Amino acid sequence: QKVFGITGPVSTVGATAAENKLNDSLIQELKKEGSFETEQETANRVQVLKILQELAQRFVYEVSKKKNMSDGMARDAGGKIFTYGSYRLGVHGPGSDIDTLVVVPKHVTREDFFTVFDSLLRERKELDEIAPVPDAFVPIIKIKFSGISIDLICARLDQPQVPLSLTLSDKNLLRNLDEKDLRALNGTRVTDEILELVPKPNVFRIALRAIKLWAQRRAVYANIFGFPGGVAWAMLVARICQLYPNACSAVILNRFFIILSEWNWPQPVILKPIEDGPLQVRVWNPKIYAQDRSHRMPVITPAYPSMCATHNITESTKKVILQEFVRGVQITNDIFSNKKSWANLFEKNDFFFRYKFYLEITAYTRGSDEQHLKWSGLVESKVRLLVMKLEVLAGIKIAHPFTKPFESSYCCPTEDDYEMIQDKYGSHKTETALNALKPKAYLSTMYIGLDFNKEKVDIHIPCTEFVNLCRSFNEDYGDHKVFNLALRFVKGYDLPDEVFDENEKRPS
């Protein structure tokens, strides 16, 4: 049974009463920490999805009519919404976006999605916000609609109709699709497979809710900065579910930390045998592809074509993940022996207390929210490259990127003030000299914690290269009247208080 994975179960023993009690405690702690939304919020999501399906049909219909098709053929053309990622898995929370895919027949172009479908959304009274990003890895429209955040992508099939009955599991659907359409289909195909690959979906969901919370709190969740993201975490949980098909989620978590802490990296985590299929694309294969051999902690997607979802993991972030696995073993063991609580497991990281030195990376923009989102996105996208350059330097013991940029915005009349913002920010010694308060200047700041092992050592070259790289991406970047980029080396005693919550106090 594929549900027991590629190695067979470790144990088919069922949960005991004591284990189920630990599981009840685990669920109550998840509830206390806000993991679950209300029944009303779930209803609200279901309603917006009905509307999205209606609009997806209307979109395909309108495009079809514009290309001179009869009413019947335009109806027949169809159009269908799917969800993927956390909502589709049922592990979403009150804040969560719905990752949503719009699948359209062959005559409906990506251009049509960004014009006709985009306009259909803008005509709705329920639309709160809309931000099209036709450039992203997967071209996307991000919206808020009746208060719910929806992330919308589009895939064009090589068939003239998209009926309501359509499922995406048939790998023949991938024939004749361009790279972007393949990418677009991959998310939903993988999510759907993960669900079919675990022995008991609700055990999986509770375990994954816990790992998502744990990973966010422990600052090991962010694919962009070299940590596993949602799909990778989902697959790691799924693997352990297969090994203990009759276990309770609390037991899955204990076994998870142990197994992954002890695992023989770079040996891969795989949920089902790697499939071949009808395309000429490479499937993950460290035997024959040197890039694949380089993956440090490979977590491989099950849907054809299999790929490594954790390719971004670096030398430094691997160490952090493994450290966090070890803490998890210690703590869950203690919870099982009734010495510690689930709340102990989910305690927030102490990133800003644990290093003597930090590198601050600040992306400034003076203009619209749009070009800042684009600029910072760009700068944010390169941070992992700086980490890889820093971490291989002789003097550097670790270069540990934080997982979330600190965001800020300001009243910036001149022209002068933008200059003054770039100056007093990043150090607690000079930061107080800000206000008001908060025409606008944006900031995104990433932090890299540094551990060094005649002192120094000199990190300025990779830093300068990083700045030059980010400026290179177009002539605008590039400017200096609008876009700017700063790297600052700070001691821990001198970190800005944006970095501590009103719950901790700064070290010295």
Q: Which residues bind Mg ion (CB under 5 A)?
A: 97
Choice among 64, 86, 306, 376 that is catalytic? 86
Tokens 């978590």 found at: 253
Q: Which of 151, 181, 192, 292 is catalytic?
A: 151
CB of 98 to Mg ion, least distance (A): 8
Instruction: Read off the DSSP letter of residue 4.
Output: G
Distances from the Cα of 125 to the Cαs of 56, 121, 335, 378, 391, in angstroms?
17, 9, 50, 33, 50
Question: Residue 85 annotated as binding?
Answer: yes
Residue 393: partners with Cβ closer than 8 Å, 6 or more residues away: 457, 459, 462
Q: Is 76 a catalytic residue?
A: no
128 is in an annotated binding site: no
Is residue 118 annotated as involved in ligand binding? no
Count CB neighbours of 25 within 10 A: 15
The two structure tokens encoding residue 377: 């996105």
From 65, 67, 76, 97, active-site residue: 97
Active-site residue, selected from the candidate residues 221, 358, 410, 447:
221
Closer by beta carbon to Mg ion, 78 or else 187: 187
- At its nearest, how many Å lie between Mg ion and the CB of residue 29? 24
Is 451 assigned a catalytic role? no
Q: Is 292 annotated as a binding residue?
A: no
Tokens of residue 341, six digits: 């609580």
DSSP codes joined into one string, 459-477? -HHHHHHHHHHHHHTSTTT
21 is catalytic: no
- Pick the catalytic residue from 87, 112, 181, 212: 212
CB of 452 to Mg ion, least distance (A): 36
Q: Which is nearer to Mg ion, 188 or 332 (CB)?
A: 188
Tell me which amino acid residue 305 is.
Answer: P
Q: How far is the CB of 266 from Mg ion (least distance, A)?
A: 27
Question: Which residue, 191 or 254, has its beta carbon nearer to Mg ion?
Answer: 191
Does the active-site annotation cover 99? yes
361 is in an annotated binding site: no
- Smallest distance from Mg ion to CB 229, Å: 9
CB distance 204 to 291 below 8 Å? no
Give the C-alpha separation, 54 to 57, whole Å. Answer: 5
Q: Which residue is nearest to Mg ion (CB)?
A: 97
Q: Which is nearer to Mg ion, 97 or 334 (CB)?
A: 97
Residue with smaller CB distance to Mg ion, 33 or 97: 97
119 is in an annotated binding site: no
DSSP string, 89-148: HT---TT--EEEEEEE-TT--HHHIIIIIHHHHHT-TTEEEEEEETTSSS-EEEEEETTE
Binding residues: 84-86, 96-99, 151, 212, 221, 230-231
The residues annotated with a catalytic role in the active site are: 86, 97, 99, 151, 212, 221
Residue ranges for the known binding site for ATP are: 84-86, 96-99, 151, 212, 221, 230-231
